Amino acid sequence: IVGGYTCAANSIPYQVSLNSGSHFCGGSLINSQWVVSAAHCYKSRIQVRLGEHNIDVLEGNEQFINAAKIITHPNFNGNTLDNDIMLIKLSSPATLXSRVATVSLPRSCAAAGTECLISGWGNTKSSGSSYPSLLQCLKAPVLSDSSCKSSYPGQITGNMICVGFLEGGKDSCQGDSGGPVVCNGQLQGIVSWGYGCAQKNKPGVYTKVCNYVNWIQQTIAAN
């Protein structure tokens, strides 16, 4: 998260860390046994870490649970990153409290201008390199489909939304993939891609979760 601030103690309970030796992607807890993340974060072996604030210090609230089911979207396209969403089922339900809580799914799609909250342990630099121990936070509005496409000609699909600043300075970055883009208490976006980080006229592209509510609920019901 470039141009953000350190999230308060119990401000982002639904945030999770995907680990495969070390932190490589973020995620969201939407239910005591399921986590949502980007499909390009897919690995055959994944350990989910919950209740994290400082990923380098063991503060006592953490919970390490391993992925049982790792389901990437059926139409995920590795070359275009279209349908970039992924469901992970915990081999064991997570204990809910203040530190660990779930996030709600989109009842309806977010409208342009809506202020959202993005969070993650990714690089905090648009040029250099600096990964923080503490979960970073950032507030950014959802951009109109038009401007999102003006920034990314022929690359933005119907399953993608741009949230950020065309002016640069603030944006999600490498290490923030799979993380939440919460707008109004509903998971509206999943950190996905973009040109570098915090570049002028190059806001981050996020998976449009509201188009996957149905797929999600069905998959959970079947598994």
Binding site: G21, F24, D84, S192, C197
Partner: protein
């Protein structure tokens, strides 16, 4: 791509093969991969370094 042909992670720009600045925000243990050309594949980390 025009008089040339783009390979690996390269992107075609009319008649020249540049590459991408496009990257997924995965944290790569050893960074993103380079291919024959030296350009970085969009969402593929380097298991081992470069």
């Amino acid at each position: 791509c025009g008089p040339v042909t783009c390979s690996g992670a390269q992107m075609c720009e009319v008649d020249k093969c540049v590459c991408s600045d496009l990257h997924c925000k995965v944290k790569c243990e050893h960074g993103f991969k380079k291919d024959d050309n030296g350009c970085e594949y969009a969402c593929i980390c380097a298991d081992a370094p470069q």
